[PDB]
Amino acid sequence: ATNRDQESSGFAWWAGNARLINLSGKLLGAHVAHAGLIVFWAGAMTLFELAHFIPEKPMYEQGLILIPHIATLGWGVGPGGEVVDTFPFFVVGVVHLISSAVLGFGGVYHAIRGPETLEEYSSFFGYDWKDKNKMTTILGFHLIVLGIGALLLVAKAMFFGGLYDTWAPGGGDVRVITNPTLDPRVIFGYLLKSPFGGEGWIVSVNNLEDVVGGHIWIGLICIAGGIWHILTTPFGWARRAFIWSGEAYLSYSLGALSMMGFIATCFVWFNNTVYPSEFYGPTGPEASQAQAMTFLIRDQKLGANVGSAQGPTGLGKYLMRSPTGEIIFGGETMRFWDFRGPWLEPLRGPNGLDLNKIKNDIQPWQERRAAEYMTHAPLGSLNSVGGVATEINSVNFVSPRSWLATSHFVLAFFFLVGHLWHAGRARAAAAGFEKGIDRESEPVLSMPSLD
Amino acid sequence: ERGWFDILDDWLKRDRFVFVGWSGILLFPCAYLALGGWLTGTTFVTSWYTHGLASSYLEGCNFLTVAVSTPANSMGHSLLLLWGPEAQGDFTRWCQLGGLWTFIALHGAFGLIGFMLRQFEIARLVGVRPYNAIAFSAPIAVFVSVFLIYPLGQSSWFFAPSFGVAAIFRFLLFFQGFHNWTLNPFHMMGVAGVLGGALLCAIHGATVENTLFQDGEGASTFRAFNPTQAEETYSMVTANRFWSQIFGIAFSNKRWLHFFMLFVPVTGLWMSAIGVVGLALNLRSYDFISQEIRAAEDPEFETFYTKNLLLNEGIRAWMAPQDQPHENFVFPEEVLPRGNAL
Amino acid sequence: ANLWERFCNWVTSTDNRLYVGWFGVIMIPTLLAATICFVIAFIAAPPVDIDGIREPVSGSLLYGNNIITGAVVPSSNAIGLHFYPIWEAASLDEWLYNGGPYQLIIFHFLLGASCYMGRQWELSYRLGMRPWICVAYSAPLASAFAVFLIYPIGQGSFSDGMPLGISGTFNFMIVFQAEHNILMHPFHQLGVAGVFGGALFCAMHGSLVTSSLIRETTETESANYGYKFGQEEETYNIVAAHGYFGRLIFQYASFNNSRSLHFFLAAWPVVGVWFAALGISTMAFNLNGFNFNHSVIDAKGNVINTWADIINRANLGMEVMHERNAHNFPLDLA
């Protein structure tokens, strides 16, 4: 029972996994077993979703988060996001479920049976946290792996049937990407975009050519950087800037996952390109715009002149200007005029919403989509009663966008907390005061009084 | 060891798993009945005849929606005793008339008296000063003001809080729409004492845990303490320096620190209780007269204060017909205050 | 040493009356800017068109407010989430009408308070302290981020951020109840348990320590003089306090370990308030309180109201009245 009590390890049971910091073999077990947990959930969850799935209802009426991910890759779906073949969903679920048994096998073996430390056994697989060169080497391997993952997405998009494209001319459809964006001015231009309204930083990506192109860059950057890290040791300025310890490295990764968690939250909330509204439901901005569109269509059908209709406030009841002059929907949805979506764009001209097009060109498919999106707004209760908070029971609906944004905000937040926890602990432990103040060497007692 | 009084005293004060005491004779039966009346009512008892509501697991409510509800407004402030003139010893009818409400409120009141007598009794036997009992006067002032004085100043017990999670949420919302209770400076002082108390609880726990002396080898530091040790487990000197430099001021006296931790939440709850005594009489901080005079004469003058009264006016008109069924309110659609569209 | 080295030495000095530090280099100017703008706006700013409907709300003292009604008013619904710094406006007069001060204040304040939290880590490291006081402060900080940044992001507009004022705060709460049924949300319920429990355990601890102070003074002196700053000996008897409290409840419900007791004091309100903050930050994306409206139905199909339905009626009053000139279409969808 080597290091498996507090007396010998220094760590109580509730901090038991900290007992693993310098036991690379059992720690590899923990890590591989955990990767099996992730892969397991992905496979079991997909099969569960598929078993429950009624192909003719929207995915977003069915509490689905995984099938939508598979569909966006262009598997299983045709024009408009119509499901044409559930078999690719089945394949995805089963292959992960089977794969998780393999990882679970390796995890249990390393955790429970294999060498507790790897250093004696192997110098390639063994490691010392304080070995800066071995650390950047392992980091380099993982970077190469991630770079290959990014290129797998490019391979799907370009050579293995394309991706679902909500923006495809004539209507959403799977489309092969032949001209991915390679111009670094466009690709890296996204990273320098403001995160505020009408800009949206990288969340603004609105076409699959930029999406594919960005992953070409990212795949190459990761592979190059991974090679770089295998062949270099950290520079002196790096050495002096960081703490070099397992807990420190955990902390940096916790910060990065927290940041990524917040980014994903905003991505699923606003973006309707890599989270097609056909599969995930309308965004909050989209549903609010769709409501204004709905009533403009209705009332104009009744004979209203929607361009000249002054609302109670003096602003146009249906149509008004943005602060820079663009014609936009009126009422509260004024806030959402940055919204763009395939059912609305045909009505927008160089000056914003075009009154001529509004009066003459609104098609029944646009009326339908706007009614669907207005009535699937991502508002709903914790027990999945769809609608505003005062709604009566009847409609069992909470948008996949709300489930995904809320979950990831919670996770990202606690990951920031874990970052602070571990970053601060790693600093104290490196300097030797994580267990308390030395009563005979209390720093403040050697300091001059403040006053 | 003398007469029966002193033999009873001996037995009452035995050192056992659950201390009893003379206070236990009042406390135990009253706490037991208050809690059991609550579980019994929420599990089995309706509010159909008093409120027109279902309120029990039996009728289909969940832990959030069950309550023991107040009696009908026609009961006034009846003690509603089982043997009294309303139920006349009929247990079933007494349940249907809201008898469990006054049962719980009154046993609960005597139980809190008994708990506080328990704090004094145990303090006296162990030889400590009775500041815990003193601190508990704040829970008492809150219970008595909200559950007894408030409905005694109103028309009936009907307007006391009902004993339930959602029922209490309803009570909050009623106090906003009818009393504008958020505007009341006695409630604001309560909020300061509660949030300031939670602040003191957090910051004091975190400071002690982060200025601890290394008194063991463990990276888990809880074992490195001994109750009987002479020495402080953490450094007041280092804690004082840290807060002096971070915030500008710091505690330097541990005795003052702990007294202040009693003072803040106890004082905030006592202030909120005084505001509720005023609400018993509808003596509200509802309005600022100067705001109303200006807004009445100037239809372009708007503040968050005038926005909130519009919300109150909505709450009163929309909630009153179902919340106050004895009033038989019928408000035709055309009279309901509503803004545009909604 | 060189100029830079002396500067660094000063910035990080453990000897400054107020610690500066690298976080402080960002905190000081950002907090100063937010404070000065707030004070001036709260006294003197003209009315602000919070809801973008040309209906300006007066927040400042000179325009007819008192301390309770006054606020710095959120920026205009026409702006939405657009970044509206002073230089985006044609004039200061436009900037004021549109609620520019609100954005300036909240962005500088959030940046500064985030650096306040880093500074707490920073000084604890300079002093050889354990590092997690900054983690306790993350709870109120997360709550300020929820109401000034995350909620506006979810709803698409800083006009829905919490106003910087006492009555504006109540407005935000009441509208939030109409729109999310927050009271029925378990994360807000956990926050209530956090703050009520924080207050309860604050009073408990204060009273238990105070009750067991060791006699060191006469009856004509405050007992506080019985403790001297920096003395080595504990100033109360924890064994006495535990002996009292273990008897009040039962032995194993009481702490005799001061480290465990103080950890609990930190954790209970901090965890509860993290859930409060996550309540607001997830209702930001409209995952709302439990809805049991018409959950109870009789044999025929008649609705049998519960207390949840009465809550619903109060929520409806808030909903139909709020921003009474701002909605043109039948659903309030942000």
Binding site: - | I249, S252 | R17, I43, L61, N66
Partner: peptide, 29 residues
């Protein structure tokens, strides 16, 4: 007169903060 009163009390409190910090009774070990 009311605005003057509110701003005056506020200014007194900011002054009070300055003295309570920089002219506190110094803590003595």
């Amino acid at each position: 007169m009311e605005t003057i009163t509110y701003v005056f009390i506020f200014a007194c409190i900011i002054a009070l903060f300055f003295f309570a910090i920089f002219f506190r009774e110094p803590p003595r070990i």
